[PDB]
Amino acid sequence: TAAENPNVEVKDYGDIDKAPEERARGITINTAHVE
Amino acid sequence: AFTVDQMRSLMDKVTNVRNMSVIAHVDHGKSTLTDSLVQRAGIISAGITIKSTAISLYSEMSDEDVKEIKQKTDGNSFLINLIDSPGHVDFSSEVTAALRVTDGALVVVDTIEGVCVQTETVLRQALGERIKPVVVINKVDRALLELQVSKEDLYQTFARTVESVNVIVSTYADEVLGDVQVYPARGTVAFGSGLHGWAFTIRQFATRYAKKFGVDKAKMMDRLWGDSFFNPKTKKWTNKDTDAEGKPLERAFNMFILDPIFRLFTAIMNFKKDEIPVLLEKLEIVLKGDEKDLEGKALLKVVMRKFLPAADALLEMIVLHLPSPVTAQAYRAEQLYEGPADDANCIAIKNCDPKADLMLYVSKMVPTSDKGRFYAFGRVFAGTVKSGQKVRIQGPNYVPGKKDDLFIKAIQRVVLMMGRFVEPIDDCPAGNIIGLVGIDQFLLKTGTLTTSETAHNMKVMKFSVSPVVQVAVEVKNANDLPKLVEGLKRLSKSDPCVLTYMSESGEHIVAGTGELHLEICLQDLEHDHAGVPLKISPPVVAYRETVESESSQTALSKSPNKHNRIYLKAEPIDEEVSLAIENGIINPRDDFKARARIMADDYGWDVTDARKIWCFGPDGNGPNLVIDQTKAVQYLHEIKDSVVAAFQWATKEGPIFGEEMRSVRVNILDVTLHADAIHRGGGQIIPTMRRATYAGFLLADPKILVEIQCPEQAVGGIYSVLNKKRGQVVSEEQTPLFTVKAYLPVNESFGFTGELRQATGGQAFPQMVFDHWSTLGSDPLDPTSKAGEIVLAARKRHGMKEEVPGWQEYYDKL
Numbered sequence: 066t067a068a069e070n071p072n073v074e075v076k077d078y079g080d081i082d083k084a085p086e087e088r089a090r091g092i093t094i095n096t097a098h099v100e
Numbered sequence: 101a102f103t104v105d106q107m108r109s110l111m112d113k114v115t116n117v118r119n120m121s122v123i124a125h126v127d128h129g130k131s132t133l134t135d136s137l138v139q140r141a142g143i144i145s146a147g148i149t150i151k152s153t154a155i156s157l158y159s160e161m162s163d164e165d166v167k168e169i170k171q172k173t174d175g176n177s178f179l180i181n182l183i184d185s186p187g188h189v190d191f192s193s194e195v196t197a198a199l200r201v202t203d204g205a206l207v208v209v210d211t212i213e214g215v216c217v218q219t220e221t222v223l224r225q226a227l228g229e230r231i232k233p234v235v236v237i238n239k240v241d242r243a244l245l246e247l248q249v250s251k252e253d254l255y256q257t258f259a260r261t262v263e264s265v266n267v268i269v270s271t272y273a274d275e276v277l278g279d280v281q282v283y284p285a286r287g288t289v290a291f292g293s294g295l296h297g298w299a300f301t302i303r304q305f306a307t308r309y310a311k312k313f314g315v316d317k318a319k320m321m322d323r324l325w326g327d328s329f330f331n332p333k334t335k336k337w338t339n340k341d342t343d344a345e346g347k348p349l350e351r352a353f354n355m356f357i358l359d360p361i362f363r364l365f366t367a368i369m370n371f372k373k374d375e376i377p378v379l380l381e382k383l384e385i386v387l388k389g390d391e392k393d394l395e396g397k398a399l400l401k402v403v404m405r406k407f408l409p410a411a412d413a414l415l416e417m418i419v420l421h422l423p424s425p426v427t428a429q430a431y432r433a434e435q436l437y438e439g440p441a442d443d444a445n446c447i448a449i450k451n452c453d454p455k456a457d458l459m460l461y462v463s464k465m466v467p468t469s470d471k472g473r474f475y476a477f478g479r480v481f482a483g484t485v486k487s488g489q490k491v492r493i494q495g496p497n498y499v500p501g502k503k504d505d506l507f508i509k510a511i512q513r514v515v516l517m518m519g520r521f522v523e524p525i526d527d528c529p530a531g532n533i534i535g536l537v538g539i540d541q542f543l544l545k546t547g548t549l550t551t552s553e554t555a556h557n558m559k560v561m562k563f564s565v566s567p568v569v570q571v572a573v574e575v576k577n578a579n580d581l582p583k584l585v586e587g588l589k590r591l592s593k594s595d596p597c598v599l600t601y602m603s604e605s606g607e608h609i610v611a612g613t614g615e616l617h618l619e620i621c622l623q624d625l626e627h628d629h630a631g632v633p634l635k636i637s638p639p640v641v642a643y644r645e646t647v648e649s650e651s652s653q654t655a656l657s658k659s660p661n662k663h664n665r666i667y668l669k670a671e672p673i674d675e676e677v678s679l680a681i682e683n684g685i686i687n688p689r690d691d692f693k694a695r696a697r698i699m700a701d702d703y704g705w706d707v708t709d710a711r712k713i714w715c716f717g718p719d720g721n722g723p724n725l726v727i728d729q730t731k732a733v734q735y736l737h738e739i740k741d742s743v744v745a746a747f748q749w750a751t752k753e754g755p756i757f758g759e760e761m762r763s764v765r766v767n768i769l770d771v772t773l774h775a776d777a778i779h780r781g782g783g784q785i786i787p788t789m790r791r792a793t794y795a796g797f798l799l800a801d802p803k804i805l806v807e808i809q810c811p812e813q814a815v816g817g818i819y820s821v822l823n824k825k826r827g828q829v830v831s832e833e834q835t836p837l838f839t840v841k842a843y844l845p846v847n848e849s850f851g852f853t854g855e856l857r858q859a860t861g862g863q864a865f866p867q868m869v870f871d872h873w874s875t876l877g878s879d880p881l882d883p884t885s886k887a888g889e890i891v892l893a894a895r896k897r898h899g900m901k902e903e904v905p906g907w908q909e910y911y912d913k914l
């Protein structure tokens with residue numbers, strides 16, 4: 066969507082599973098919100 | 101990248117807004133799919149950061165596409181709010197809150213694993229919020245690369261996954277919504293690989309082959325799915341999978357959509373460099389520049405992105421099928437609103453009226469980097485919220501009549517919650533999601549903001565949601581206690597599902613939904629919230645000290661002076677009576693006469709004994725009593741205070757190992773005092789009474805609701821576990837699931853939640869509340885009996901001598 070709208074911040078995979086636990090287990094643990 | 105003006109303009113056309121989230125079992129690719137959406141349509145503004153809670157997407161559809169949208173549309177631009185949802189799926193209320201602010205959901209299902217319990221759990225909760233679902237069967241690449249699966253097998257797998265899903269939907273979806281099931285032919289199911297950027301709908305292929313087969317796409321998309329066959333030999337479309345001769349016909353879906361894809365994979369991955377250019381040319385795919393040199397997966401990834409852009413498939417289902425707030429608040433108003441259905445605020449919700457009084461629901465408090473400040477996250481259902489606006493904050497217990505939970509305060513700032521960032525804005529009308537700053541202190545977790553004195557307050561899914569896992573927390577360095585007490589408060593505010601309280605034994609308790617949840621909580625508490633070395637350990641269980649029968653013989657004890665003696669016997673107080681005292685039927689301060697009539701007429705007591713209760717204990721109101729049965733003691737009235745005081749002391753600290761007494765009745769049979777008050781003084785009689793009580797006690801044969809919801813076939817595991825833990829079934833009721841109620845000793849509940857999921861295949865959900873005191877039949881004084889082991893462990897833990905002093909130790913022979 067950010068290709069169509071400059072007003073969308075892109076979030077990459079590692080920006081979403083960013084927690085130290087998530088990295089340690091290699092899964093999502095926390096809900097993440099993106100726009 | 102848009103400007104605040106562009107965003108605000110986009111937010112005016114709520115007909116072209118989509119509030120939704122992604123539902124997925126761990127590892128099914130929820131993250132990589134959203135990264136795909138964000139990279140393709142994410143929106144960004146043209147030093148305060150927040151935890152990413154929601155992301156905005158932007159999408160434009162073609163004029164023809166927009167005509168297909170079966171709902172009010174204004175133009176070809178769409179604003180999509182991808183709302184973050186927690187990862188704990190125990191039917192928790194944190195999840196329900198997140199879903200509550202969405203109207204549609206993108207459900208991710210794995211090609212191989214299919215629909216798993218976690219998936220069913222969030223979907224079930226979603227359906228309970230009248231959310232419309234759309235599916236994406238993800239990880240398709242695994243079936244082609246790893247498993248080498250065949251087309252018909254892949255098909256069958258897809259069809260079974262779609263069926264599993266529509267079983268959950270048909271079961272929990274409100275009949276008033278109509279058919280909310282999902283159908284590949286209607287474009288509500290996508291297939292693909294979030295890791296590799298390609299996806300499609302039958303519609304896109306219909307558009308592609310319509311103007312080529314000389315047929316309108318409405319006809320084409322019906323033919324591109326299910327039992328439609330095109331016999332190249334007859335050049336005709338039929339619904340029979342065989343021809344006249346009976347030979348096997350390949351399904352249109354396989355022949356026109358899968359085959360081209362299969363051929364691209366096979367040619368590119370096998371380096372057939374003379375077959376790739378032709379295939380690409382036929383599909384009208386153009387490699388430019390450095391792309392012409394790619395091979396293998398690299399070439400594949402690039403070719404599939406051009407052929408069928410993933411985000412494109414997902415955005416198509418979102419825009420065309422997920423519902424836009426005007427449409428939804430019309431049939432969601434009544435549930436959302438506790439008040440009158442005819443009420444002015446309920447109507448404003450149904451109409452999503454921005455000019456009405458305010459009806460803003462606070463979904464949760466979100467952590468910010470603004471030194472311990474939490475911003476309120478929520479949705480404006482009615483009216484419009486403004487910066488510096490005077491509003492009425494109503495907690496979870498507020499009622500229009502009382503002033504409970506009410507908090508009038510101005511809203512400091514209205515901010516757009518964009519990922520980890522915020523953007524101050526002046527106002528926000530009904531139908532939008534928004535963040536409020538300055539509400540921290542007044543609200544923790546859910547709430548309801550209104551601008552009407554009449555306004556009533558606002559309301560929750562088949563993961564654990566109860567704080568069943570708990571530990572005792574304490575600072576390693578005494579002086580740190582202040583930070584710990586403060587950290588717990590900070591921790592509680594940031595986590596809705598976390599619980600902290602002080603135990604009967606004086607320990608700070610922290611409890612979490614599950615072992616993992618509790619672990620994050622303790623880590624965060626220790627590292628951030630409190631930031632001090634913490635010591636973690638199990639909770640100490642409290643016990644009661646009672647008697648099973650009357651004293652086998654009169655208890656006799658003398659005072660230090662050796663001049664005073666008390667003669668008494670102890671006997672059990674009936675449970676119904678102890679309960680009556682504990683719960684308010686028999687009270688310490690009631691008029692002794694009326695109380696005695698009740699104890700005698702209703703509980704079998706002798707009315708004289710009752711009229712003569714001297715006190716309750718411990719703390720003057722406990723379920724233990726001293727009754728006066730003496731006949732001619734001269735200075736009785738003068739020792740009463742000493743006797744009462746000694747009882748408060750005796751019942752507070754039992755002789756078995758220092759636990760409080762319960763259900764203990766003490767009858768004073770006789771008292772012999774010295775003639776002169778000097779030697780009769782409390783300092784003489786208080787010890788006597790306490791010593792005699794302990795003796796009467798020891799001479800009286802001393803002794804010291806788990807609700808589970810689950811499927812039938814799983815119930816067997818429940819009985820299996822319970823039997824392994826001195827459990828006992830109580831009730832088995834019920835066309836939802838089953839609910840087994842049972843008694844489970846507290847000292848048998850550590851790890852129970854784990855052994856239960858393991859014995860029910862993760863289908864059982866426990867709930868536990870303290871129920872009763874229960875008398876252990878074993879000897880408390882026998883170090884090897886069940887009760888005795890507990891007594892020996894507590895004694896050693898407290899540095900007392902192991903042997904329990906026996907009654908003879910408090911008996912003073914005449």
Ligand SMILES: CO[C@H]1[C@@H](O)[C@H](O)[C@H](OC[C@@]23C[C@@H]4[C@H](C)CC[C@H]4[C@@]4(C=O)C[C@@H]2CC(C(C)C)[C@@]34C(=O)O)O[C@@H]1C
Pocket residue numbers: 567568570601603604605609639640641642643846868869870
């Ligand atoms: C809403 O959540 C509830 C449930 O988790 C449960 O009812 C739990 O029980 C706590 C205990 C409560 C009992 C009464 C106060 C008297 C006896 C108490 C207990 C002591 O052994 C039994 C349970 C478990 C406890 C020790 C081991 C911590 C209790 C305690 O508070 O010490 O309390 C919380 C607040």
Ligand SMILES: Nc1nc2c(ncn2[C@@H]2O[C@H](COP(=O)(O)OP(=O)(O)NP(=O)(O)O)[C@@H](O)[C@H]2O)c(=O)[nH]1
Pocket residue numbers: 091092093124125126127128129130131132133239240241242292293294295296297
């Ligand atoms: N082959 C292939 N792999 C993919 C695709 N989409 C995601 N993956 C891979 O599958 C793995 C899991 O993706 P991920 O997005 O983290 O899964 P999840 O569903 O978010 N995780 P969890 O359930 O723990 O949240 C990753 O290694 C990712 O590269 C795809 O389209 N094709």
